[PDB]
Symmetry: D2
Amino acid sequence: AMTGVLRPGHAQVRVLNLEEGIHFYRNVLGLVETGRDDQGRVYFKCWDERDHSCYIIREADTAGIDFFGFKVLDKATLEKLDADLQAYGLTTTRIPAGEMLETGERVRFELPSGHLIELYAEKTCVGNGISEVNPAPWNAQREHGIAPIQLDHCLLYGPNIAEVQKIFTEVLGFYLVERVLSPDGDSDMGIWLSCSHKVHDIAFVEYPEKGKLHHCSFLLESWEQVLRAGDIMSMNEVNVDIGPTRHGVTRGCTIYAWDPSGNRFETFMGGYHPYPDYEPLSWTYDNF
Amino acid sequence: AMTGVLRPGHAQVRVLNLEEGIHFYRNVLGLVETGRDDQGRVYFKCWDERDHSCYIIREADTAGIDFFGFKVLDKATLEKLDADLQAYGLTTTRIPAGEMLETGERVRFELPSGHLIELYAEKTCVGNGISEVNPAPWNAQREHGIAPIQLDHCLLYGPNIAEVQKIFTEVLGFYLVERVLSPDGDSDMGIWLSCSHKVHDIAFVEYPEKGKLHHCSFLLESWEQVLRAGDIMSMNEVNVDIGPTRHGVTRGCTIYAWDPSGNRFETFMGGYHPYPDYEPLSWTYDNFAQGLDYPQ
Amino acid sequence: AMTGVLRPGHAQVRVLNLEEGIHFYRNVLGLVETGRDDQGRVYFKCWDERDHSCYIIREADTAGIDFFGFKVLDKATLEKLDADLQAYGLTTTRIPAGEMLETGERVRFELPSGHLIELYAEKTCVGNGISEVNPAPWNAQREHGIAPIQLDHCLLYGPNIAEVQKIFTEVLGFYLVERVLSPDGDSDMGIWLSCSHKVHDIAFVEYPEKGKLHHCSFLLESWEQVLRAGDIMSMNEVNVDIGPTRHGVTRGCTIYAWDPSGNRFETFMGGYHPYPDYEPLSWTYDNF
Amino acid sequence: AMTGVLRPGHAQVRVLNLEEGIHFYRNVLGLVETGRDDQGRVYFKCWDERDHSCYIIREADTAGIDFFGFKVLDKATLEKLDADLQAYGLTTTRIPAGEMLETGERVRFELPSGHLIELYAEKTCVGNGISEVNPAPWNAQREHGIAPIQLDHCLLYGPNIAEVQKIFTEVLGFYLVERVLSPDGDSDMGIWLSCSHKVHDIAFVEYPEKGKLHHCSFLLESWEQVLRAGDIMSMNEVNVDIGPTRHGVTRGCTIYAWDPSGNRFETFMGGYHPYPDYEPLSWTYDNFAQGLDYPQR
Ligand SMILES: CC(=O)/C=C/C=C(/O)C(=O)O
Ligand SMILES: CC(=O)/C=C/C=C(/O)C(=O)O
Ligand SMILES: CC(=O)/C=C/C=C(/O)C(=O)O
Ligand SMILES: [Fe+3]
Ligand SMILES: [Fe+3]
Ligand SMILES: [Fe+3]
Ligand SMILES: [Fe+3]
């Protein structure tokens, strides 16, 4: 049974230029635009997802991540986690339903690494553009731009990863899948946590400046889709960070590229199938 | 988080000739043999899995499945589930630890469909044959025979699917991902159940005879692997049921073939990513064909 | 060097309904329409080919193939081939330039199996839509319907395949790549012929009826494009013959399906790389 | 019909250590060893090819390529080519048959770029390890190391590429498929030549030093095989030049890596289907400067 925290639900990122951000995410990445609110933020969802949104961009004077939200099983679970976060010593804030289009109230809190995390139980299901009866495997949207399958996770750069692990494993029901060791001084320089049977729903790398966003990740169907994504990036003049390649950690075959505003994102596929009862895999600093 | 029933743990199948069963499953399908007990049962597991076994064969008068077990989160969970099963009205049997090689105690019970289901919390962890520190992407095992990644699920044939569904969803925390409706005067002729975010961990099809096994399924990495599996089957003159194709119900790209004793198995990959908050997908009986084989 | 007969140039097929044929080939298979003549024929080419046409449709009262042409190196070669065919004992007809849109004169003749074959040295090159300078990876045409890369070959059914083989190898410059032996008759039941280094540019199977067409084939880029083609066929309710699979002969991974008129076409990829110095592979009849 | 020069036939490369060279080529790249002659050379062929050899290694003081040869249709063609090569103004030297294991005599000559090219019509056929009757699509060989399918081509670095182009297109029956234009004093800084319907059978890049070998190339079955090759390289600590990536000057998806001796080779798949009647594609120098075959890089 999947319970408690289910999956990454949304990432709100800052773009130095809205209209340009809308163009790149709609035509290059191929996210489906679902709405635009009064604040001027525009909502997107991957084609095969069913909820109203997973990626929200906001015009601002600085690039980066405002916050990262997770969907939880139900309202009861949301209330419990809220109380658990507080019992743990974290101060929670409650964002009202509607504050974000088609989204219920959210429980927000700040990690020691400086990042803002949200938890919510409700978000309107809009569907994946395919009928619920005798559904096709895909439709035209699958080939509009890169067209990723789902918001897979994000990797965050922050100062107190050690205590961040505790919050996630002891309060949020996540578990360590992989980690990178420090130079023998044995302190996880980085961690890959899962709250399902995926290699990771979120990751953290130890960093001096808090609240930094390394990248938001989008899942693709096959290695050939990663190849196609690279061609679309090239044809649209997208600034690529590190070309298509196999990633040691999580066995991911990915591509790192930057959007107009300088936000790094990933399109990948691959990875094993860990479960709560598995012991994490480790990587020596020299390998990292 | 993944709690309660985590995933398919093992399937013990009956084979006519134990020796050919070993050869086929070790050399053709590519399972890693991990043991043989005193009752004459050989233990296999997929190379990338970590637990001691997921597939166990036994020489018997007839082919088919003896039982299908699921691994649960923890002992407290095992005891808890066993309690709810009884409180539900199902009589449960307690199989002691060790009865199965490298396996802990299991909670076994029979379904309305006639199939025997087990629940267990402990199974020795042997690893995937790759190092725990700075692991390689894969190894030679990945190319020994078909070499599937995990026991994905199984599809069972038996009566009273409606009742079977209620047990899985109301007691074992599963949820319906897809169903194939009966003709008019609706009811479900087929159901695909998930206890995770996989399209299905197990499925049932309404059939008059009970305790029947349609197939056990093994997960592959890609579509090219599915074609490779096809070639390997041909090279070993393995009887293939439905060649490489797309399902529709699950979107799974697969191939069905038979082992030497007539037991159908499957090697596939693909599918979307359902979660418990999702509403099930429905297929009409009239459009059943496309649901079973999409391209055709 | 590639000389003599270079490659399959065009197949003109008969459709029971021009309208349904235009829609099917242009939007399901994803061929690119390049013209229509005052005779009511529609011209198509695969998007990545450079010549004006490779597949022509003509509304008639019966499905099937009218003729199949091959492009040769140059005019001198065309004349040479015409002379050799007649010196061989065959009667030739010369079709003038322009009888077919954007096409030069053609040399036509009938095979003992009843099929009409043509040879031509000139056909307007129109390009693949991509620039000849710094060509972008690929365009949108790549994903318009199935979108095959080239007319790969055709498979013809008819009698006297033995006589047909001699004409192609002794006169036209092809060589036998693969064969299916007949049941102790010491006469091949099927032949796969190449005039390049492709597994085959044309193939014949022994059959009582004369001039029959089994299928025209189109090449795809990968096994996954084959899966995609099947998906597209299902989506457009296309009637599929043999599901995605691998051919023993050629090693090709394919799908056979029918157009609205009952004409079988193929979408496949794969196969080894034979050369004129290679010996043919053989398949026992009992292992067809 | 495929006539005249048919395809790359063999490449003899120099390795600093004959032993580690044999292990790398039979275990990592997955080439099939077919022999070892008196001179100390070890011969290999790709599993799916049918002739005795396509890659030969020779222990030497320096790394690089000794010569690159093409197989021609038949003996008559070999004689004709030799005559046309001399008629053109090149001096040719006939290498005796048997000088190379299982290889007939060869017509050797030097290009203006300094590279030695050979032509031969006969080389013993040893098969691809698969039955000639009811042949399977592949076997264990396909999964031994990377296991390339064929010696696809090579890319040489040397001067006077203009004169090399003339020789290949006017005498050897090849044609230009792609080119890289010079910054502006227009000419060609790079050329990709074909003697078939492949994107290229051989390529040259204008470079001051004569006889330079950029890389020999090996063809793979699919994009996933390239990814696989990447994993095998990482596992064997192979020195990778430029990881899996989409080319451009061929639409190829490839990986450039090095021999333990420092010989660069390529494992790729992909590309379109040019024919003799086609006009070449062009790349601006500034584009080439960002590609994988740029002298700097
Ligand atoms: C520091 C860094 O980028 C590591 C990322 C790990 C992953 O598994 C992925 O990106 O899929
Ligand atoms: C027609 C039928 O029985 C269902 C086929 C779909 C499946 O996902 C399976 O068998 O695992
Ligand atoms: C006569 C028949 O059914 C088999 C044909 C084999 C092939 O490889 C093809 O058609 O490309
Ligand atoms: Fe990532
Ligand atoms: Fe199944
Ligand atoms: Fe065909
Ligand atoms: Fe190359």
